[PDB]
Amino acid sequence: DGASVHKMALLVPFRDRFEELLQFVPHMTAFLKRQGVAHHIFVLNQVDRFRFNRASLINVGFQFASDVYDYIAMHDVDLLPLNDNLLYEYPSSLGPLHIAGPKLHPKYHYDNFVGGILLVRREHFKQMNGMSNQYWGWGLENDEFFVRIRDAGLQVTRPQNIKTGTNDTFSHIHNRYHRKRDTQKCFNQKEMTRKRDHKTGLDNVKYKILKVHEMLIDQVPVTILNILLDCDVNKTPWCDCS
Numbered sequence: 001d002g003a004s005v006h007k008m009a010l011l012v013p014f015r016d017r018f019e020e021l022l023q024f025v026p027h028m029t030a031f032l033k034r035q036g037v038a039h040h041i042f043v044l045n046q047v048d049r050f051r052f053n054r055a056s057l058i059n060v061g062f063q064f065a066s067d068v069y070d071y072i073a074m075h076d077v078d079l080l081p082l083n084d085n086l087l088y089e090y091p092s093s094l095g096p097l098h099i100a101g102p103k104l105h106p107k108y109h110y111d112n113f114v115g116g117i118l119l120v121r122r123e124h125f126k127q128m129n130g131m132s133n134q135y136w137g138w139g140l141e142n143d144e145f146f147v148r149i150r151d152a153g154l155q156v157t158r159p160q161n162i163k164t165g166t167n168d169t170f171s172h173i174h175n176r177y178h179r180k181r182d183t184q185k186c187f188n189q190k191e192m193t194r195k196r197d198h199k200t201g202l203d204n205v206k207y208k209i210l211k212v213h214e215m216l217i218d219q220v221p222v223t224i225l226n227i228l229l230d231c232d233v234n235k236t237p238w239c240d241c242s
């Protein structure tokens with residue numbers, strides 16, 4: 001019959017979370033198969049020694065993923081949906097589809113939280129020049145992206161009529177001592193990362209993909225990108241506070 005189907009690039013920024021990944025892959029694969037979502041998991045493995053930069057990794061994963069994927073899911077590796085009514089569907093013309101809304105997320109409950117699991121059309125992501133590159137270490141990168149969404153004249157949509165709440169919609173298995181949040185600030189990080197970034201994004205992220213690995217986990221194919229991010233210490237020296 002030849003019908004076209006939407007295809008989701010599941011982008012998972014990643015470093016030192018193997019145990020999480022082993023739970024993530026079978027869970028998401030089963031979950032998405034149940035709702036018939038065609039997709040592939042890309043593990044975006046940061047292999048430079050700078051601080052963790054999930055936003056730049058997402059930009060890299062976006063560039064790498066084939067054009068056949070017409071939308072992406074920017075997805076934390078430790079955050080699993082427990083409710084089948086969370087549809088990972090092709091977002092509407094309105095803008096990004098935010099799965100892990102503040103009324104459903106176990107921890108983050110502010111109105112404009114768009115983190116955890118955020119689905120974006122290829123065209124919309126392109127239109128916004130992707131994510132800022134200036135976020136090294138934990139925090140703020142999704143909040144700046146929220147402003148990009150608005151500046152592009154788009155809106156965030158979230159699932160409606162979800163009956164579960166903050167305690168039973170997602171599993172967030174992330175112990176703050178086990179997997180520490182890198183909240184250090186150095187140089188003028190605080191002042192700079194709190195400012196909207198009109199200068200960097202998808203179009204100027206600097207990197208090399210050193211290696212592409214094809215992995216199977218219990219028969220499920222997953223792609224690993226070993227990504228070497230570059231840091232310009234003349235611009236973002238807080239990529240390394242050592």
Ligand SMILES: O=c1ccn([C@@H]2O[C@H](COP(=O)(O)OP(=O)(O)O[C@H]3O[C@H](CO)[C@H](O)[C@H](O)[C@H]3O)[C@@H](O)[C@H]2O)c(=O)[nH]1
Binds near residue numbers: 052116137139
């Ligand atoms: O050293 C790290 C740090 C993070 N991650 C990945 O990045 C994801 C998000 O990082 P955290 O789990 O450490 O932070 P939070 O639990 O506070 O998550 C929220 O805060 C982050 C702010 O940086 C992101 O916005 C994220 O989407 C949002 O759900 C992780 O799940 C994991 O997939 C790694 O792989 N290695």
Ligand SMILES: [Mn+2]
Binds near residue numbers: 076174
């Ligand atoms: Mn987490």
